[PDB]
């Protein structure tokens, strides 16, 4: 017999993004190629099947650290990185590509799914 | 508010 | 120019719910009486003025363990916490006071809203 | 997915 605050899932997300871009409690690097990307392991998790693998495994858990394969584009990372912590993402027709293998590595399956959608549309 |  | 997924902010928070639920990556203790409540300090901050306020605080930021006002009843934060984590908010007829002062302490301006409607409405 |  509850009642539901409609806006709330929504608030809760960009107060997340707010402390993100504010680099507040912050306790993960995400390294892509030279680039590196400050995070919050919980959102990285709750978005992600790779982080979730990465973070509920008993040694890894507690790494500041995190090396993504090398094939990883630090663009495609930055994009689905925006889209966890706001719903967006930018897709273009001169990044879809690169999402797509980023999103299939990081395991991020509804992203996955509509860039199959739009490169089958062109 | 609503009623889920 | 970007695409929205609507149900994105949604499927984060159920997650964030489930790693709750499980205890994973929690990094705080939340002390109400007698009563104990694991949680994440960014989901806190997220929902609340006063978690905000308390984990932005180069000290306070640091800590495990937050002991709460004495008068703070650990049903009413129970409610609060429950609906931090899922949008839900279990409003009864013997709890709306308890729920109203805890959101008051809390600084959380929508639940305080909606107990103040219905308890006009009564 | 929408156009927001
Ligand atoms: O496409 C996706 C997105 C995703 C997110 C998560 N994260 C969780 C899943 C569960 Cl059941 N509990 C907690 C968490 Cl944080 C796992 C796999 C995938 N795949
Ligand atoms: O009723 C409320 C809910 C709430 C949440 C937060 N938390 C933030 C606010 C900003 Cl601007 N950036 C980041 C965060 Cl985590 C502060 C005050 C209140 N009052
Ligand atoms: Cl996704
Ligand atoms: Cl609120």
Redesign the pocket.
Known sequence: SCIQFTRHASDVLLNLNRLRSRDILTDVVIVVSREQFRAHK?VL?????????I??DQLKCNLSVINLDPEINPEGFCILLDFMYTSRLNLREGNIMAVMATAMY???????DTCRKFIKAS | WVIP
């Open positions: 919980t998790m709750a978005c992600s099947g790779l982080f979730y693998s973070f509920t990081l395991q991020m399956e509804h992203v996955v």
